[PDB]
Amino acid sequence: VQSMTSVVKAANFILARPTLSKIITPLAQKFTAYAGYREMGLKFNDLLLEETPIMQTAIKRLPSELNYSRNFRILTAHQLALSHQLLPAEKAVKPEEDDNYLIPYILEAEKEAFEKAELDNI
Amino acid sequence: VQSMTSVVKAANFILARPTLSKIITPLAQKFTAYAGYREMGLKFNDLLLEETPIMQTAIKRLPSELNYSRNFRILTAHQLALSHQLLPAEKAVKPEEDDNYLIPYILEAEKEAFEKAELDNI
Amino acid sequence: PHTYMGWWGSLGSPKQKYITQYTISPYAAKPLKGAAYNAVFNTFRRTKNQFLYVAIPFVVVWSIWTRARDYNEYLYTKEGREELERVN
Amino acid sequence: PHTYMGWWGSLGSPKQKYITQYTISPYAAKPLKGAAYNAVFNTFRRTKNQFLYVAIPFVVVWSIWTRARDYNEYLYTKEGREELERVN
Amino acid sequence: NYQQPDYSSYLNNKSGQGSRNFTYFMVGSMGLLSAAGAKSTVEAFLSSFAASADVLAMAKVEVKLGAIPEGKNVIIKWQGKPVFIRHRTADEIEEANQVDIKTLRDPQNDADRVKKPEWLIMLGICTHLGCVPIGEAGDFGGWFCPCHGSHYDISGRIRKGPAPLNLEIPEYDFTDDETLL
Amino acid sequence: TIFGGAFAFQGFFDVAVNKWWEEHNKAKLWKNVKGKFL
Amino acid sequence: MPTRKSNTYLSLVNSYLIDSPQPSSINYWWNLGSLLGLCLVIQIASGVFLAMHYSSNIELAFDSVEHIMRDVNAGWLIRYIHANGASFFFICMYLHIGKALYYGSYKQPRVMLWVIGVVIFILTMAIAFMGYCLVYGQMSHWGATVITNLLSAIPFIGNDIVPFIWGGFSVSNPTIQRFFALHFLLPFILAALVCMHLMALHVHGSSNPVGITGNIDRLPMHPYFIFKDLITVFVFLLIFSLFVFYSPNTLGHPDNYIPGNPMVTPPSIVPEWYLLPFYAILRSIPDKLGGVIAMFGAILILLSLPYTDRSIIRGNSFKVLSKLAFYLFVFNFILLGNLGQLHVEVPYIQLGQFATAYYFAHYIIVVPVISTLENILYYIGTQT
Amino acid sequence: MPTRKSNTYLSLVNSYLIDSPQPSSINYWWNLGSLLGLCLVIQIASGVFLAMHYSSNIELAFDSVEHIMRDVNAGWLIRYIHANGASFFFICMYLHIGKALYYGSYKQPRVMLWVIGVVIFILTMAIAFMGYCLVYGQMSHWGATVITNLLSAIPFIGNDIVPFIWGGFSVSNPTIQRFFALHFLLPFILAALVCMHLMALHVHGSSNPVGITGNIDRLPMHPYFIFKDLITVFVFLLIFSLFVFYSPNTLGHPDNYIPGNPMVTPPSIVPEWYLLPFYAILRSIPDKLGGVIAMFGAILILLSLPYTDRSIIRGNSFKVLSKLAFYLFVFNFILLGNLGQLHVEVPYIQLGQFATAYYFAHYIIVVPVISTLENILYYIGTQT
Numbered sequence A, B: 001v002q003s004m005t006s007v008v009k010a011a012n013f014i015l016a017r018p019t020l021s022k023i024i025t026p027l028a029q030k031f032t033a034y035a036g037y038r039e040m041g042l043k044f045n046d047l048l049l050e051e052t053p054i055m056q057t058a059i060k061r062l063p064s065e066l067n068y069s070r071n072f073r074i075l076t077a078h079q080l081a082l083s084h085q086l087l088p089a090e091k092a093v094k095p096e097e098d099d100n101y102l103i104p105y106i107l108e109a110e111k112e113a114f115e116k117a118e119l120d121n122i
Numbered sequence C, D: 001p002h003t004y005m006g007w008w009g010s011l012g013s014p015k016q017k018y019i020t021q022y023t024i025s026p027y028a029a030k031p032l033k034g035a036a037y038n039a040v041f042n043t044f045r046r047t048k049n050q051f052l053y054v055a056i057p058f059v060v061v062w063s064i065w066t067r068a069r070d071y072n073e074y075l076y077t078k079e080g081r082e083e084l085e086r087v088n
Numbered sequence E: 001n002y003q004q005p006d007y008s009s010y011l012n013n014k015s016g017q018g019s020r021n022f023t024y025f026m027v028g029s030m031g032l033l034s035a036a037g038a039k040s041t042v043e044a045f046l047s048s049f050a051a052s053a054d055v056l057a058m059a060k061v062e063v064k065l066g067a068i069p070e071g072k073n074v075i076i077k078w079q080g081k082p083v084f085i086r087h088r089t090a091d092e093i094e095e096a097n098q099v100d101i102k103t104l105r106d107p108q109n110d111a112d113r114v115k116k117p118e119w120l121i122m123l124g125i126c127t128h129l130g131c132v133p134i135g136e137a138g139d140f141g142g143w144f145c146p147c148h149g150s151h152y153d154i155s156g157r158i159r160k161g162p163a164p165l166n167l168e169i170p171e172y173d174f175t176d177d178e179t180l181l
Numbered sequence F: 001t002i003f004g005g006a007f008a009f010q011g012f013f014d015v016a017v018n019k020w021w022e023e024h025n026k027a028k029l030w031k032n033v034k035g036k037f038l
Numbered sequence G, H: 001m002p003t004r005k006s007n008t009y010l011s012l013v014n015s016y017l018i019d020s021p022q023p024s025s026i027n028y029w030w031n032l033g034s035l036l037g038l039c040l041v042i043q044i045a046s047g048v049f050l051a052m053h054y055s056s057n058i059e060l061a062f063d064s065v066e067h068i069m070r071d072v073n074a075g076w077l078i079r080y081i082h083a084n085g086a087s088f089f090f091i092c093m094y095l096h097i098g099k100a101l102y103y104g105s106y107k108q109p110r111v112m113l114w115v116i117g118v119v120i121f122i123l124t125m126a127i128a129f130m131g132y133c134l135v136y137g138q139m140s141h142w143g144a145t146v147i148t149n150l151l152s153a154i155p156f157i158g159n160d161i162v163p164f165i166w167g168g169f170s171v172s173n174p175t176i177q178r179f180f181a182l183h184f185l186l187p188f189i190l191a192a193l194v195c196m197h198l199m200a201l202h203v204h205g206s207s208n209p210v211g212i213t214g215n216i217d218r219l220p221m222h223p224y225f226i227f228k229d230l231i232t233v234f235v236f237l238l239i240f241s242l243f244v245f246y247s248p249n250t251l252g253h254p255d256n257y258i259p260g261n262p263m264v265t266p267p268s269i270v271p272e273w274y275l276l277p278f279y280a281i282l283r284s285i286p287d288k289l290g291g292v293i294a295m296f297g298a299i300l301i302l303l304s305l306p307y308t309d310r311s312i313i314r315g316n317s318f319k320v321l322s323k324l325a326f327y328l329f330v331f332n333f334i335l336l337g338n339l340g341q342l343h344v345e346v347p348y349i350q351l352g353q354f355a356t357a358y359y360f361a362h363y364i365i366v367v368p369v370i371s372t373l374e375n376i377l378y379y380i381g382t383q384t
């Protein structure tokens, strides 16, 4: 529901101030680690709700290699959920591998949608 | 339901003998005239039940000009039935135009189907 | 789904290129153009054409029914009593 | 019908060419390969991972409920009678 | 083409027929256990359609017998159907003495249709489209089926009409001035 | 065709359960107790 | 995409009532279907508003009905609406089936539809009879008795199945309660069969009077045929008002207002008018088992009609002999119904036997023979 | 084409049960849906087999129920099956809704589905209560009285609507007959809403625990998820047998076996267990109008849940704070239900007010705040 643009704006709002970054960033890292999605072979962007015209547009706009890697990650996560087993730390998605690859495309789609809404509303 | 081949066979079975042709042919002509389909712009073949794979195949193989004429005749009949009016004798389908144009194609399709059934049944 | 009727885009009808259709906006046409002439002349024409097929079977069935009813009435009247005993 | 799920031919999934799937006919595999190890080790793993999220809310709510129940019991006991009159 | 993962451990130790036979046995056993359970449930439910204990208790209820005029036809309500308890006089017994092996859909006699002429019991429900016959309109002198005009003989036998059988005789037993169903 | 196995299972379970229940509830049943109140 | 086509529910409503491509040439006889639906709806509505005040108990049934008539606000109106709407439902269904036979809507593409329809018809009467047994009038009680006795004719299970359906040794409180429950439900199972019938229709669409493909000229159900349905609905409701308000009891039987008692048999045990044609057959066949078999066959032979109709042309509008035979069949059916209500008199019993004979002979001889002869006549006429 | 796909009805059955492409990762929590359907079916079945022996009349209602228990063959079994199946239907529905909340099945693509589901829930309670009034036990009678009195709180129409629903000046024979009819019916309207819910599901398919697209790996519902449904069905029937046979009255209230009389008020007028959470709210709110408004809002706010859930990720399986909040909400709901059955004691009234406050605060604060905070935390964590 929340626009990816809004959450990115809030994250940059916080990150611009070390007073809050030094407090929240460790908490955010711990919360992402405890979220449990990495151990299933998923990156943050894979969890995003696809069933949204903006999101579907962004995925359709994704490069072939990234799209195939995402397909494999989703399939692996589904298999792990089905088998009720998790990857070990060796095979789990390392924190540095959460590259937020899909955020640029989603932000571009959101910018296009917002421009459309702004222009047609005048 | 009855195969067009069977009815054609029976009609030729009768027509081959003047003893029965001289009796039935006038009756058949009067029955077709009184059938009331001619006054609606329809030929006998237009009345045939299209919803049968053999009939659909026969129609599909129909020449372009005959197919278009049949489409116009069917549309005219639908319009007349809808408007509850009939063509006068001048515009009605004269007996000589009941050319049985569709019978050859239906018979070809029936022969193909019968050959298939006979061959695969051995 | 080889349904012999499809949706609007493809209703299963064959190619019909050379036919043209014409209609006037009802906002411009008479609703009662043929009502007066139709209700009498056209209705009488339909009735006359379809009459015989209703009449002949109706005449046959109603004649049989009248015969049966008259016979039963005769049976249950006094003059028929003896025959009612004979038939039963 | 831009449904986010289609039928088998086109489920709406993106192209996934470079992935390969592997399975054995069940008539050739064990049904109980992991049952013994799973039911203990895997079940305990799931329970341990999910415990805190159920325990913390449960302990909070049950502590509140226990406090309320004990207070009510004290109220309706003779020693609490006066307080029951004071609170009401 | 490429290396497959090793299934060595995953493989079953059974033969081709053994594993398939056991799987089909288990599936069939599940199917037939489900069939047995569904049969039990459906029979238990359908038993609700059957007469409840109340109805069974109410039936087989004795009738207050006793002295009554000879030839009079009493009425009862045993199991809903009217019971034509009639104390036909010796005249009815004498009339029934005339045997009939023909011209009767089911030739019978008071030997089996009644225990004693002093008390004659017969359900009033007719044979074809069961109805209550009239107690004096019978063409044969007994009861008459108004719906079709059928005539019931004084012995309950079907004389004329659409009768498919003879006037049923309930299973009521007799006793000392009592009816013992 | 299926009804055969279903009926066989029904009868098997019914007779087995009835026998076991009667033996386990022997003393508490009416049939065994009536003699004492005769 | 318009919202009427994207939304699933509005998509279905569109596919069935808005852009459903009906043939342009369908006359008013094709509006009976919707009419029947309306009838069902109104019946259900009336029925529900009767269930709120009706008592299923045998001793309270008839008295509760009279309570509805005399004390419940608009209770008379709802009671008469239900009673006369049963008859009107069957009038619409008989005209429905007559149209299907005349215009040959029972042929190959819609045979499945035909089958479903036949089932519905049977179910409907097995709901009407049930309802008629609820009031527990003299006719109600004795009809229940007659029917349940006829069910006893089955050799292997007929001896004990009758108590099973009764709930006792004769029609009593368990029987009326059972009929009340089954009668409230079976119409709702029939509401599912109606949907099934509609889908079996929608798969291949509806036929037309001309008996040819409608695909050449199709029109959306809305507005044209929606407004034709409105015309027929208002006509039906106007005639329904005539009967309900100004002459409600003519269709029913007076004896049904007598409280039912098993000890008194009415002079004539006869069903309502629209079961008469079938009951006539039940009266004509000597054997009870044979009688019930023939009674149900009189309906089920409709299932054989599509296969016995060897015609290569859909419908009868252009078929002289077929029209003559169909009209004679309709009048024979009316005669059979008329004989249904009469007593068993000599000429009436022989005429009923002959009427049943011809009713079945129609399907099993006339339609085949007439259809083949007409195909031959068509070809041998146009051959010149 | 296989016959299961050409035939329209087998085509539908295939689309819904055989080839329906369910996600491969759905766990047993997704089998509750079918379970609920089974429950409904069994309930309807039991209900019908009770209508054949239940008498709607007020004076005969409880006596007829006892007749079912003591005299009708297997009548006790059917009666207990119906009564305990209501409770089990609500257990399955509560787990159904709990799964929907936990795994975020209420989000955008299935919002339509959500709303139908919510309606069903309300309808179901407005069928359960009515059923409980049919027995006309002390609890039944006084619950009917309390609910109808609460209905009077509406300012403009509340003064006269209560006699309208009663059919009189108090709960009496018209009321019980009305409830019997509407209660026999409303489950059959609910069977239509169940079909609507299934279609609203089928349009977009079913979610999965991971909260991502299932299109990457789908499996046909048959055989895999059919057999999972059989496992859950046999487990449900085994527990249902435990309750029905070995402990049937534990879920119910003993006072309902006392013949109801308006002159005697039981010491505690309390609903069955599964209405307790809502009734608690009704007890907590002082104003009667406010009480009923909050009682219905406690259900309807589920309609606002999808819009208050600002999460960019479906479900909670990967959301620490959301999981914690959801479990706290579930335990608060259980506490509210538990307070529902207790008398009005000081700590209990204050705790019920606080519990209702937090129950609504969940939807209107926690889900928004928690979801936004968690989106921010995810992005600011993975940003490195």
Ligand code: HEM
Pocket (backbone or CB within 6 Å): G040, G043, G044, G045, G046, G047, G048, G049, G050, G051, G054, G064, G065, G066, G068, G079, G082, G083, G085, G086, G087, G089, G124, G127, G128, G129, G131, G132, G133, G134, G135, G183, G184, G187, G252, G256
């Ligand atoms: C296709 C649907 C139905 C048909 C054809 C039908 C037919 C009938 C008929 C013929 C009667 C006899 C009435 C009389 O002799 O005056 C009747 C009575 C009755 N039916 Fe229906 N019925 C249908 C559905 C229903 C429904 C849905 C209900 C309840 C919801 C219902 C409840 C009753 C009741 C209570 C009576 C007797 C009440 C009275 O007459 O006062 N029926 N029905």
Ligand code: HEM
Pocket (backbone or CB within 6 Å): G029, G030, G031, G032, G033, G034, G036, G037, G040, G093, G096, G097, G100, G103, G105, G106, G110, G113, G114, G116, G117, G118, G120, G121, G194, G197, G198, G201, G205, G206, G207, G208
């Ligand atoms: C009882 C409730 C019924 C409903 C709701 C219903 C509904 C419909 C509707 C709306 C149509 C299309 C319009 C029309 O034909 O008037 C139709 C067609 C048809 N119905 Fe029914 N109908 C009912 C009863 C029956 C029954 C009992 C039969 C049994 C044979 C039947 C046989 C047919 C046939 C053969 C058609 C195809 C007509 C054609 O294609 O021209 N109908 N139905």
Ligand code: HEM
Pocket (backbone or CB within 6 Å): H029, H030, H031, H032, H033, H034, H036, H037, H040, H093, H096, H097, H100, H103, H105, H106, H110, H113, H114, H116, H117, H118, H120, H121, H194, H197, H198, H201, H205, H206, H207, H208
């Ligand atoms: C009362 C009878 C019900 C039936 C027959 C039914 C049927 C189903 C079925 C079969 C499913 C898919 C499998 C499953 O979720 O178990 C489903 C999904 C769902 N149901 Fe129901 N359900 C019922 C009750 C409800 C109710 C009252 C709600 C109210 C919120 C509800 C909410 C949902 C949701 C949100 C989903 C989507 C789950 C997902 O996508 O993972 N269900 N329904």
Ligand code: HEM
Pocket (backbone or CB within 6 Å): H040, H043, H044, H045, H046, H047, H048, H049, H050, H051, H054, H064, H065, H066, H068, H079, H082, H083, H085, H086, H087, H089, H124, H127, H128, H129, H131, H132, H133, H134, H135, H183, H184, H187, H252, H256
């Ligand atoms: C979602 C569907 C239904 C639900 C949730 C439901 C719920 C209930 C409940 C909770 C009771 C109280 C029983 C007790 O206190 O022991 C009850 C009683 C009753 N219900 Fe249902 N019901 C449903 C459908 C039906 C149907 C379909 C029928 C009839 C066709 C029906 C007829 C009855 C009757 C007759 C009783 C009282 C009979 C007795 O207990 O002896 N209900 N219902």
Ligand SMILES: Cc1cccc2c(-c3cc(C(F)(F)F)ccc3F)nn(Cc3nnn(C)n3)c12
Pocket (backbone or CB within 6 Å): G086, G125, G126, G128, G129, G130, G132, G133, G139, G140, G142, G143, G144, G146, G147, G269, G270, G271, G272, G273, G274, G275, G276, G278, G279, G282
């Ligand atoms: C009063 C009466 C007498 C004789 C027969 C009947 C029937 C009847 C019922 C069925 C069916 F098996 F379908 F139930 C079939 C044939 C029948 F003749 N019904 N009734 C009462 C009635 N008549 N019309 N209605 C609305 N109810 C009778």
Ligand SMILES: Cc1cccc2c(-c3cc(C(F)(F)F)ccc3F)nn(Cc3nnn(C)n3)c12
Pocket (backbone or CB within 6 Å): H086, H125, H126, H128, H129, H130, H132, H133, H139, H140, H142, H143, H144, H146, H147, H269, H270, H271, H272, H273, H274, H275, H276, H278, H279, H295
């Ligand atoms: C006995 C009793 C007392 C107080 C309230 C109720 C309710 C009740 C009904 C509704 C609804 F409007 F939905 F009807 C809402 C809230 C409620 F508290 N119902 N009952 C009897 C009962 N409880 N559970 N069942 C299966 N029936 C009460």
Ligand code: FES
Pocket (backbone or CB within 6 Å): E126, E127, E128, E129, E130, E131, E145, E146, E147, E148, E149, E150, E162, E163
């Ligand atoms: S009354 Fe119908 S045959 Fe005896």
